[PDB]
Amino acid sequence: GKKAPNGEFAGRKLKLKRKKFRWSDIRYKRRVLRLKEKSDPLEGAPQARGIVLEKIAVEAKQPNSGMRKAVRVQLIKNGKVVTAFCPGDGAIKFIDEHDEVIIEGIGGPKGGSMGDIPGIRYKVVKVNRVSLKELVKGRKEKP
Amino acid sequence: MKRRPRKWKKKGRMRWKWIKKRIRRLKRQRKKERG
Amino acid sequence: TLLDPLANALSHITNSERVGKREVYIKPASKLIGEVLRVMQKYGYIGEFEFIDDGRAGVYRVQLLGRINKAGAIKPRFPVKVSEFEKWEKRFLPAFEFGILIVSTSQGVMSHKEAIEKGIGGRLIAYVY
Amino acid sequence: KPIIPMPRSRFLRVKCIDCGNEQIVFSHPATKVRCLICGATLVEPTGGKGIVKAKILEVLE
Amino acid sequence: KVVGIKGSVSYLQALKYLKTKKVTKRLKEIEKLVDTLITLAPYAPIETIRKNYAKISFNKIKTVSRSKIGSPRIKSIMLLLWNFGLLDVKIIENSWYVRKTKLASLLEENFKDLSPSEKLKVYLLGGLLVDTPARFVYRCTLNGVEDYKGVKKAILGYLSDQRSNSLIIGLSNMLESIKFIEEAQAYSGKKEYIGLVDVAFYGLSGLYLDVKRESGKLTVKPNFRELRALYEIDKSVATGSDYGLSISKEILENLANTKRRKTIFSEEVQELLVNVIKENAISISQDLQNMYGII
Amino acid sequence: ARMHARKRGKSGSKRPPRTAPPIWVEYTVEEIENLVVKLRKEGYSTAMIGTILRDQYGIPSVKLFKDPDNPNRNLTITRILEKHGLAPEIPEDLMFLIRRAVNLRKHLEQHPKDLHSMRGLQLIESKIRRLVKYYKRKGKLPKNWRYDPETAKLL
RNA sequence: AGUGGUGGCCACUAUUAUUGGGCCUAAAGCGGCCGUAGCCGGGCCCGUAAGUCCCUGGCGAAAUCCCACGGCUCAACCGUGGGGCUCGCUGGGGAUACUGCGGGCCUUGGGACCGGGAGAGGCCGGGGGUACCCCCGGGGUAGGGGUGAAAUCCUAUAAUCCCGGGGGGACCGCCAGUGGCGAAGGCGCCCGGCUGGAACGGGUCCGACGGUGAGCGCGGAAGGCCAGGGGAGCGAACCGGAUUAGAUACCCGGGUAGUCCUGGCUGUAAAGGAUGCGGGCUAGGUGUCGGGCGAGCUUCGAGCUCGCCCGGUGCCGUAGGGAAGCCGUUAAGCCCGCCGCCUGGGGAGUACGGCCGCAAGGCUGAAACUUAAAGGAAUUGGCGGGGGAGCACUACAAGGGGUGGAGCGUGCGGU
RNA sequence: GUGGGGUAACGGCCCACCAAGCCGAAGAUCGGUACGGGCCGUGAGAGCGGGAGCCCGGAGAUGGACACUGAGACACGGGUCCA
């Protein structure tokens, strides 16, 4: 029937109902219990400093065909290990074994894996404190 | 058991009755292993 | 079960005039209904309105001039002071000073325009445009 | 459906056959209308109007 | 095994509120339930059973609300009443056969016009005063028992003490209940099964005890203030064996430490309870011999 | 007739919008009181008393007569019974439900397997309890008074 | 002299809906009913003035914010002046329209009574029907049964089949419906006994006793379970015969639990109208059911025909609504009340925990991670061991010629 | 609650007795989380979010515990003890 309660002395229920059903929301639940801030390997950090362990590539989702290069990074901060996509043309050669590297989220939908490559969450920015974009452009030199 | 009628559409999925039987089987064996 | 004569009456009026009848009879007649019926007729929305002594609760007879677009009773009796009145005009009326609202102030049921110069607050009762 | 509900039932001023008792009776009785003096039945309460058995003299509203 | 009462584990907590004057709906329910049970069971004296006993129809037990009570609840209260020697109950294929004991019909008669709380309290105390498994548990507590292990060791010793023939059957049931529920109360946090030691600790919780649940355990603790009053009552009417369980020096001194508490009931009730069992100690004791004892 | 059945049937009845008693009536206000007390001492309730008055005596309504003993209250058969030590302490309407409940309870005692009648009981006792609560609010019943089936047997 | 990437917050979003969302088909009304708190409540009079409103005293610091002026080029910034908050508090005066509180009055709502009439309304006893199975006797040879075919299977110690007797359990066909009744599940042989309810007509009685319903209580299809009985047919499991590449199936022949009675548990379903309940308003047409009424017919039995009013029960349909399918007074249209539920898909109705149950299970119920759709109505083709109609020789019906048998030519598959 | 103690000061703050009270479904207790406010960000606004940066109030000197001296402290550049 009519959306209820509409009473002038119905503040308690009109408030309780809204508070209850605000839990049916998912983003609010995600924030107030901060479980984004409990599941995170990066602990709410848009950057992190890690060591590379081995270079791996993955197959693009169909119908996209190719080889997407990336590496495996254990994190010096806490110790968790995650994949790290490497952008740039032939940039896998620039990134070597056992490299101090700077890694950051890849900005996909909801922060998920970007575009046509699955699983991955992060991309590399600086390798040994040197920005990778210029090294793709060749303007700078790794130490 | 709570349900959702939306599952009963057989597009790409087993008939729901058999799935609901199998899940019962798994729950049975698991509780038996615990006790 | 019946709960509020006034909103039922205003819905009756509006629904009866959407099809566009001429004479409308409202069954649950009360004093406040008459005080309401005074106001808009004073603005010429309705024609004659009168009371018929039924014997149980009285009936109200109204002739419709085909002037009102929508006439409804705001239920939750919002108390409103003077200086903030505009905040409600944007909620029930289609344009600047289009239509009216009914308030039950300390001095009785009466139109909202006449209350601005009389300088009286009160609880919103209904509206029509 | 009228604006105001009127009562369909009437009352009847009735003169009895035997003892000539004059009485006022309801048009829709629920029990058997017994005369005061002779006691004979006058009106029979049916599903609708009661079946008068004496002679009507005058209807009353 | 013998009593697998499941799904009413916490239904017996409410007795502790009988220690104070707190009144709850649950305690009211217990009161009316126990009154109805006692009323149903007749005081008649395998053929005796189902001839001068009373079959219990679970679905026919209703509150004054025209609402039923859970079968485990009725089972728990009946089993408790038996544990306090107040009702003779027997288990056959899908039927519980009850009968009023001799302590019952006397505690019933002498206190016909007390409060429901007073009636229940005197019932428990009268049961405790005589040689009942509840009395054994109370003695175990006096020895400092606060666990199932302590009471099981105590009863093992007593049964092995060559003078256990007066209550051998009931204590065997106690040991049985301890068995197959030790896991629930010690090795699995989830208990979902109340043993006879547990219902024994309850009831004492309704007089002088408090119980704490710890991952199945039923840790026990009395209070000396209240313990003093009925300790004095017991030594005043010593119609019950020690079972070869000495009072601990610690509990002894702590009872000596505290000040005198109120005498639970009015002194008229105290003396009535004293004299009723004093004058009929032999009959109730031999009835208990018949009930729990071999011969 | 919708509290339980929720069926909107209207077997109700219609009264004319009459303020004054009809001219054609001959009985004065004093005679109606005598007639109603005569019927009541026989043991007739106010409802059936009224039916008889309208049926054979042909009086439309006692409520159309104004109380000689009070200028601002219409005369009612119940008030007339009260005027002469005949009004019932338990109002008729609830007394009838009490007796119906008792007799039905006997029937259920004899017939445990009729659950339809069980539900009929379950609703008519809710009616009794609702009116008891109402009268407690109004005060016509004692505050301590509470229907009990064993006591209802006495009534 | 900025510019890009990333992470957190608001808007975008009426995807948090007080303003302002939905719940027939897309996630989303619990199977049903009762009922406490709470919430929402009929008309009139009198009083009170708590809320409500107007005036006024004290008070909410500074800082920030709005505006004029002035100073630093101007600006920002600063001052002079006027204004604003959570201003939620408090002193006093004034009003009585609505709510609240007290007293009085009145029936429309609701409840109560009475008269005939309707209904698979429930429980209990008695009577009885048809069919089916078993047993006995008579007759009868030579089979029966079953399928696409058969087979298993019964049968000559007389089967199937016909007649005459005995026992047994289950169910009460047609009438029967778009019918009725019930809160829902559900309810049908006849009679008798008890019992509930509604509708109609009469207010004849109480005087708002009302609606909703968190918590609570209740009964509630099949199936399963506990204890005892019972078991004609049917038939989970199981056992055979068949079919098939494969048969655990569909088909056939047997067959235990079950299905039936007594006591109790289980609380379940596409329990679907996939539509929570109360009131009022909004074109109409159209039949039956119940009750009432007005006429006419009436062998005078509401027995029969036409109109009207009420209640329930379909279809069509004006406007209107909706994404449409469709709904459209028995609303999915417009207002007035209350509770439940819903917030992309999957994991998942899962894990853990709690409560209930004898058990199986029931009532509650997440997260990690992954994905760009899932999903709904509806248009056009395509296709159907779907239907209907029409055709037909690169098709068949009837008829005739002839290849594949032998070799050779012609080009081809393969060396 | 009675009658007392110590306090600069009233108060179970503390003591002896007396009695069973107090709180909770309008959410006690328990747990999670967190200095409160003037204010700030966004937004047409209803509103949502935040409280570090300037002012007021609250609290703390590694965790803990304790005195003296002083009108003012259990005292950052005074003192004593454990880790």
Numbering used by the authors:
A (entry chain BO): 3 to 145
B (entry chain B2): 1 to 35
C (entry chain BJ): 2 to 130
D (entry chain BY): 3 to 63
E (entry chain B3): 2 to 46, 51 to 300
F (entry chain BR): 2 to 156
What did the authors write?
In this study, we present cryo-electron microscopy (cryo-EM) structures of dimerized small ribosomal subunits (30S) from P. furiosus, revealing a unique dimerization interface facilitated by a novel archaeal ribosome dimerization factor (aRDF; previously known as PF0560). aRDF forms two homodimers upon interacting with two 30S subunits, establishing a head-to-body dimer architecture of the two 30S subunits. Positioned close to the platform of 30S subunits near the neck region, the interaction surface of aRDF dimers predominantly covers the interaction with 16S rRNA of the 30S subunits. Additionally, aRDF dimers directly interact with the conserved eS32 ribosomal protein situated in the intersubunit surface region of the 30S subunits, crucial for intersubunit bridge formation to initiate ribosome subunit joining. The structural architecture of the 30S dimers, along with the protein’s ability to suppress the formation of P. furiosus 70S ribosomes, classifies the aRDF protein mainly as an archaeal ribosome anti-association factor that inhibits ribosome subunit joining.
The resulting cryo-EM maps (Structures I and II) revealed a dimeric architecture comprising two small ribosomal subunits, mediated by two well-resolved homodimeric structures of the aRDF protein. A 3.2 Å resolution was sufficient to unambiguously assign the protein binding sites and the conformations of aRDF and 30S subunits. In this arrangement, the 30S–30S dimer is connected by two identical aRDF homodimers, each composed of monomers A and B, and remains unoccupied by mRNA, tRNAs or any translation factors. The analysis of the cryo-EM data using maximum-likelihood classification revealed two distinct conformations (Structures I and II) of the aRDF-mediated 30S–30S dimer. The two structures differ by a slight movement of the 30S subunits toward the central axis of the dimeric architecture, using the two aRDF homodimers as anchoring points. Specifically, the 30S subunits were displaced by ∼3 Å toward the center of the dimeric structure, accompanied by a rotation of the 30S head domains by ∼4° toward the aRDF homodimers. The head domains of the 30S subunits exhibited a lower local resolution in both Structures I and II, indicating a degree of flexibility. Although the relative positions of 30S subunits vary between Structures I and II, the 30S conformations within each dimer remain similar to each other. Monomers A1–2 interact with both 30S subunits simultaneously binding at the platform regions. Monomers B1–2 interact solely with one 30S subunit binding between the platform and h44 of 16S rRNA.
